[PDB]
């Protein structure tokens, strides 16, 4: 399948070169997979989600996304126009308040929630969790992400936006999950992207158009935007049967575009997420 005039990041993940604008992908499109977006919530009524999104848990007075961040990330995973995996099922877990903040204890509870809640959902092709959040190093936060991964969920986490080594941030620094840095449309490391040996992969993160609250759209930047590209890619590849939740991060690294990014510090992987789709 071909989506013309796609957001640059979608075109990038199906291309061996920057500078194109059509997204190519297998029409299975993540059908039968599920992606949990652990964030500020999801505006499930947005026409872009087509009834495939739902809130399943909140720790606050509402499950609605009063911020936009979680809706944007969910749109990059799975919206019809802005999403990588256009037929996946999206489940929102609101661990962040409408200012975008959350206590680590709540975030940990949300991760353990997903590890159990997947057993209440129909995801025959597999389960992914997208975590566009983080703060300073916490062994307890890292352990929660490790448990979620161990339970059979492909965990993708943001590297962080400090232009610093991600070893000092959580859950970015957890070795067993997929830690995602950000790149721009010219294949440069995004100016804010964290780096370091703990990164597994880069995805598009600068000037990413996606869904927003109020039935709208906007372009924003962050490792928060790169992470759902990778989460959606994992769901798409799992639906194709090419990999599993336990092996998808490594598979994405195996099949990435290699050595094409600029300003990658010595010792950080130079790997850009790529779907290897042959139309």
Which residues are part of a known binding site?
16, 175, 177, 200, 260
- Catalytic residue flag (residue 72): no
CA separation for the pair 255, 266 (Å, rounded): 21
Query: What backbone phi and psi angles, to 5 degrees, belong to 104?
Result: -60, -35
- Catalytic residue flag (residue 254): no
CA separation for the pair 131, 179 (Å, rounded): 10
Residues belonging to the binding site for Ca(2+) are 16, 175, 177, 200, 260
- Catalytic residue flag (residue 262): no
Structure-block tokens of residue 267: 């010792």
Q: Who contacts 98 (Cβ-Cβ below 8 Å, separation ≥6)?
A: 40, 60, 65, 66, 67
CA separation for the pair 273, 235 (Å, rounded): 13
Measured on CA atoms in the order 187, 7, 209, 44, is the torsion positive or negative?
negative
Give kind and range of the element (H or E) at residue 254: helix 248-254
Q: Which of 14, 15, 39, 79 is catalytic?
A: 39
DSSP 165: B
How does DSSP assign 17-63, residue by residue? SSS---EE--TTTTTTEEEEEEES---TTSGGGTT-EEEEEESSS-S
**SS3 at position 221:** coil
For strands 271-272 and 257-258, give the pairing.
antiparallel
Q: Which of 14, 15, 33, 69 is catalytic?
A: 69
Q: Which residues are catalytic?
A: 39, 69, 224
């Amino acid at each position: 399948a071909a989506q013309t005039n796609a957001p640059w990041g979608l075109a990038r993940i199906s291309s061996t070169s920057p500078g194109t604008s059509t997204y190519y992908y297998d029409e299975s499109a993540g059908q039968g997979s599920c992606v949990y977006v652990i964030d500020t919530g999801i505006e499930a009524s947005h026409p872009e989600f087509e009834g495939r999104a739902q809130m399943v848990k909140t720790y606050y007075y509402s499950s609605r996304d009063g911020n936009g961040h979680g809706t944007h990330c969910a749109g990059t995973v799975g919206s019809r126009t802005y999403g990588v995996a256009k037929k996946t099922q999206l489940f929102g877990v609101k661990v962040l308040d409408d200012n975008g903040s959350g206590q680590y204890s709540t975030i940990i509870a949300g991760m353990d929630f997903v590890a159990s809640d997947k057993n209440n959902r129909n995801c025959p092709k597999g389960v992914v969790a997208s975590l566009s959040l983080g703060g300073g190093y916490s062994s307890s936060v890292n352990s929660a992400a490790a448990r979620l991964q161990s339970s059979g969920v492909m965990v993708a986490v943001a590297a962080g936006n400090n232009n610093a080594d991600a070893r000092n941030y959580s859950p970015a620094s957890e070795p067993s999950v997929c830690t995602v840095g950000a790149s721009d449309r010219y294949d440069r490391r995004s100016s804010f992207s964290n780096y370091g040996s703990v990164l597994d992969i880069f995805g598009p993160g600068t000037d990413i158009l996606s869904t927003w609250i109020g039935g709208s759209t906007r372009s924003i930047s962050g490792t928060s935007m790169a992470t759902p590209h990778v989460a959606g890619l994992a769901a798409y590849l799992m639906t194709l049967g090419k990999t599993t939740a336990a092996s998808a991060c490594r598979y994405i690294a195996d099949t990435a575009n290699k050595g094409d990014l600029s300003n990658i510090p010595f010792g950080t992987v130079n790997l850009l997420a790529y779907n290897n789709y042959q139309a």
